[PDB]
CSV table of C-alpha atoms and ligand atoms in Angstrom, one decimal:
chain,number,residue,atom,x,y,z
A,4,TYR,CA,-34.5,-1.4,15.4
A,5,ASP,CA,-33.4,-4.8,12.8
A,6,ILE,CA,-31.6,-6.7,15.3
A,7,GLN,CA,-29.8,-8.7,12.6
A,8,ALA,CA,-29.2,-6.3,9.9
A,9,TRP,CA,-25.4,-5.6,10.8
A,10,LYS,CA,-24.9,-8.6,9.3
A,11,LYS,CA,-25.8,-8.5,5.5
A,12,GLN,CA,-23.6,-5.0,5.8
A,13,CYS,CA,-20.3,-6.4,7.5
A,14,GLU,CA,-20.7,-9.0,4.6
A,15,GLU,CA,-21.1,-6.0,2.1
A,16,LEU,CA,-18.2,-3.9,3.8
A,17,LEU,CA,-15.8,-7.3,3.2
A,18,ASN,CA,-16.3,-7.1,-0.5
A,19,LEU,CA,-16.0,-3.2,-0.6
A,20,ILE,CA,-12.3,-3.7,0.9
A,21,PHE,CA,-11.3,-6.9,-0.4
A,22,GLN,CA,-11.5,-4.9,-4.1
A,23,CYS,CA,-9.5,-1.8,-3.0
A,24,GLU,CA,-6.0,-2.3,-4.2
A,25,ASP,CA,-4.3,-1.8,-0.7
A,26,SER,CA,-6.2,-4.9,1.0
A,27,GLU,CA,-3.8,-7.7,-1.0
A,28,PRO,CA,-1.4,-8.2,1.6
A,29,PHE,CA,-4.2,-8.7,4.4
A,30,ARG,CA,-6.6,-10.7,2.4
A,31,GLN,CA,-4.9,-14.2,3.2
A,32,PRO,CA,-2.9,-15.1,6.3
A,33,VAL,CA,0.7,-13.9,6.6
A,34,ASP,CA,3.2,-16.5,4.6
A,35,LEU,CA,5.5,-17.6,7.0
A,36,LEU,CA,8.2,-18.7,3.9
A,37,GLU,CA,8.0,-14.3,3.3
A,38,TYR,CA,8.8,-13.8,6.8
A,39,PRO,CA,10.3,-16.3,8.6
A,40,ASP,CA,10.7,-14.3,12.5
A,41,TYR,CA,6.9,-13.6,12.3
A,42,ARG,CA,5.4,-15.6,14.9
A,43,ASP,CA,8.3,-14.1,17.3
A,44,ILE,CA,7.2,-10.7,17.4
A,45,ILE,CA,2.9,-11.7,16.4
A,46,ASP,CA,1.3,-14.0,18.9
A,47,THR,CA,-2.2,-13.6,17.0
A,48,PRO,CA,-2.4,-14.1,13.2
A,49,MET,CA,-5.6,-12.9,11.8
A,50,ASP,CA,-6.4,-11.7,8.1
A,51,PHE,CA,-9.4,-10.9,6.1
A,52,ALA,CA,-10.0,-14.4,4.5
A,53,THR,CA,-10.9,-15.7,8.5
A,54,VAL,CA,-12.7,-13.2,9.4
A,55,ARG,CA,-15.0,-13.2,6.6
A,56,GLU,CA,-15.1,-17.1,7.3
A,57,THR,CA,-16.3,-16.6,10.3
A,58,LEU,CA,-18.8,-14.5,9.6
A,59,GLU,CA,-20.6,-16.8,6.8
A,60,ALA,CA,-20.5,-19.7,9.6
A,61,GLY,CA,-22.5,-17.9,12.0
A,62,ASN,CA,-20.2,-17.6,14.8
A,63,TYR,CA,-19.9,-13.7,15.4
A,64,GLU,CA,-22.9,-13.1,17.6
A,65,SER,CA,-21.9,-8.4,17.0
A,66,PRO,CA,-20.1,-6.1,15.0
A,67,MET,CA,-18.4,-5.7,18.0
A,68,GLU,CA,-17.1,-8.8,17.9
A,69,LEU,CA,-15.7,-8.6,14.2
A,70,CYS,CA,-14.2,-5.3,14.9
A,71,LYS,CA,-12.2,-6.6,17.3
A,72,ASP,CA,-10.6,-9.3,14.2
A,73,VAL,CA,-10.1,-6.6,12.3
A,74,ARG,CA,-8.7,-3.9,14.6
A,75,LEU,CA,-6.2,-6.6,15.5
A,76,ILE,CA,-5.1,-7.2,11.4
A,77,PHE,CA,-3.9,-3.4,11.7
A,78,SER,CA,-2.1,-3.9,15.0
A,79,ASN,CA,-0.4,-6.8,13.5
A,80,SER,CA,1.0,-4.2,11.2
A,81,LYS,CA,2.3,-1.6,13.3
A,82,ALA,CA,3.7,-4.4,15.5
A,83,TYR,CA,5.8,-6.8,13.3
A,84,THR,CA,6.3,-3.4,10.5
A,85,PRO,CA,10.7,-2.1,11.1
A,86,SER,CA,9.5,1.6,10.1
A,87,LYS,CA,6.6,3.6,10.4
A,88,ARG,CA,7.1,5.0,6.4
A,89,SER,CA,7.2,1.0,5.3
A,90,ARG,CA,5.3,-0.1,2.0
A,91,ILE,CA,2.8,-2.1,4.1
A,92,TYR,CA,2.1,-0.9,6.9
A,93,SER,CA,1.0,2.5,4.5
A,94,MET,CA,-1.7,0.8,2.8
A,95,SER,CA,-3.1,-0.2,6.8
A,96,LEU,CA,-3.2,2.9,7.9
A,97,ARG,CA,-5.2,4.3,4.8
A,98,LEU,CA,-7.4,0.6,4.8
A,99,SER,CA,-8.4,0.8,8.2
A,100,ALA,CA,-9.6,5.0,7.8
A,101,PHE,CA,-11.9,2.7,5.5
A,102,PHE,CA,-13.1,0.7,6.8
A,103,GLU,CA,-13.9,3.1,10.8
A,104,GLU,CA,-15.7,5.4,8.5
A,105,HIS,CA,-18.1,2.7,7.3
A,106,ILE,CA,-18.2,0.4,10.0
A,107,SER,CA,-19.2,3.6,12.8
A,108,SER,CA,-23.0,3.4,11.2
A,109,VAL,CA,-22.8,-0.2,11.2
A,110,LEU,CA,-22.4,-0.6,15.1
A,111,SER,CA,-24.7,2.7,15.6
A,112,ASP,CA,-27.0,0.8,14.3
A,113,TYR,CA,-26.9,-2.1,16.1
A,114,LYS,CA,-26.5,-1.0,19.6
A,115,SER,CA,-29.6,1.2,18.9
A,116,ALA,CA,-31.7,-1.7,18.1
A,117,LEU,CA,-30.9,-3.5,21.5
A,118,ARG,CA,-31.9,-0.8,22.7
A,119,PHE,CA,-35.3,-0.9,21.8
A,120,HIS,CA,-35.5,-4.6,22.5
A,121,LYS,CA,-34.3,-4.0,25.8
B,1,RYD,C1,2.0,-8.8,7.2
B,1,RYD,N1,2.8,-7.2,7.4
B,1,RYD,N2,1.7,-6.5,8.6
B,1,RYD,N3,2.9,-5.2,8.1
B,1,RYD,C2,4.3,-6.1,7.7
B,1,RYD,C3,5.1,-4.7,7.3
B,1,RYD,C4,6.3,-5.4,6.4
B,1,RYD,C5,8.1,-4.6,6.3
B,1,RYD,O1,8.0,-3.5,6.2
B,1,RYD,C6,6.2,-7.0,5.8
B,1,RYD,C7,4.8,-6.9,6.3
B,1,RYD,C8,3.8,-6.7,7.1
């Protein structure tokens, strides 16, 4: 029933994600010199460095808010890819499966802790 425990659990999951080779295209903002049409397709850019900095600044109130931004990384890859067989999109699907498998207990424990508090 620790209402604060999610934050260190999200720090440790981001460290696992940074060690995975599948995260490399997603660690920093998409390079607009490499992809000059990116902002004609994608309204809200997001990357794992941005998510870690927001967490470390004390600018997430809950793990649900962190989860919305990580899901935006994956939806941006699905919207920008020219093919469902592309290399980088293929990497996004494996990393999304890994993230969802690990975030589920973080979300459940936080929501349970908050119900006990209230
Ligand atoms: C950043 N991102 N996410 N998905 C992408 C797909 C491509 C091309 O297959 C290029 C860049 C991508």
